[PDB]
Amino acid sequence: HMCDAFVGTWKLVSSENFDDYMKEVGVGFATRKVAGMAKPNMIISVNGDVITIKSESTFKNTEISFILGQEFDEVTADDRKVKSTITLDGGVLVHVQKWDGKSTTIKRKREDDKLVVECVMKGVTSTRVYERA
């Protein structure tokens, strides 16, 4: 019942500072422009210990499946090959990606009827808000 309030289908409704976050991460111009236009669906499901997070958009479709605390190799939408670990910390899903001596963290939290996604790269934070679809 660990992630019950995350399960479902969520649609992006607002984004702030995502271009700057992507710049900090090293995403190139053309990918930033097309990625930043996207209005993804985030689909979260759980089956036993396995959590699946899908992102569906006109830009890319991605899917990760994982067990909390158990590292996995991930190819990100911007084609980084990263080692990821996702944990639950105080009811927040915390997703750390490591590559090339760098690290970024994506936090997903339930707040009122929204799912709020905060992406941090060094001093740059972006906040993305999703609503139930």
Ligand X SMILES: O=c1cc(O)ccn1Cc1ccc(Cl)c(Oc2ccccc2)c1
Burial class (CB in 10 A: 0-12, 13-18, 19+), 74: buried
Smallest distance from the beta carbon of 127 to ligand X, in angstroms? 9
Cα–Cα distances (Å) from 73 to 34, 42, 76, 99, 102, in that order, read 24, 20, 10, 10, 15
The amino acid occupying position 131 is: E
State which residue, 93 or 106, has the beta carbon closest to ligand X: 106
- Range 57-116, binding ligand X (CB under 6 A): 57, 59-60, 76-78, 106
| Bind-site residues for a fatty acid | 128-130
Question: Which residues bind to ligand X, rule: CB under 6 A?
Answer: 22, 27, 31, 35, 38, 40, 55, 57, 59-60, 76-78, 106, 117, 119, 128
